[PDB]
Amino acid sequence: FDPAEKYKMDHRRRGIALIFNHERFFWHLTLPERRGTCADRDNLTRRFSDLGFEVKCFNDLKAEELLLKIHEVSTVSHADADCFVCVFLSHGEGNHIYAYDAKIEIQTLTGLFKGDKCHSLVGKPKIFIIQACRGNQHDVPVIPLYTLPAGADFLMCYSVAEGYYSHRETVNGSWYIQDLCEMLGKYGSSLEFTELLTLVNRKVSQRRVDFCKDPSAIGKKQVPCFASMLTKKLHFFPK
């Protein structure tokens, strides 16, 4: 048993990174536009391309279209890939995100990549990154005083902990994606990925709502949250 065991990242390809980028929504969902989201999309595209990923973007897909595209990707072979990355940039609440016209439960998306459903990703990292609100709580600032399970090797990276609002700057992009991208740029090719996500947690936790039309929201906060079902150290050393 090797406490330093790393995933094998020496396949021909790094793998695909999908980005679902949602700026506007069907009028009747009564959701505000997400200015700054195409900035996130471009930022991620650059950082993940730099790490060797084949980045593919889809903008404002309807739910049916989105589901079709994700099914398609889960069906193609990833035999010659190190891993798979899937990003959602949208509104959300509870355990769902929004496509253009309807909500989709996140489990619906991830289930397609479980080991029994996607054999060619078995034993490979399946990384989901979600920039979206997760409820209606606005976090307040405080100060200090063998076989494999089919569910294995997922890493779920959320911009905020369960139940909370997540923040987006109209020009620079979301807090979380800005800080994630900054950390990918500096440390992506060297640090272990969960170690890097922890740095992101710290970066985002330092930010605050500096100005707001609603005085009650000034100084409000956000901590991201990642869930690991990973079984090994994950690195993105230059291929």
Partner: peptide, 4 residues
């Protein structure tokens, strides 16, 4: 800053 906006809320997602």
């Amino acid at each position: 800053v906006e809320i997602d």
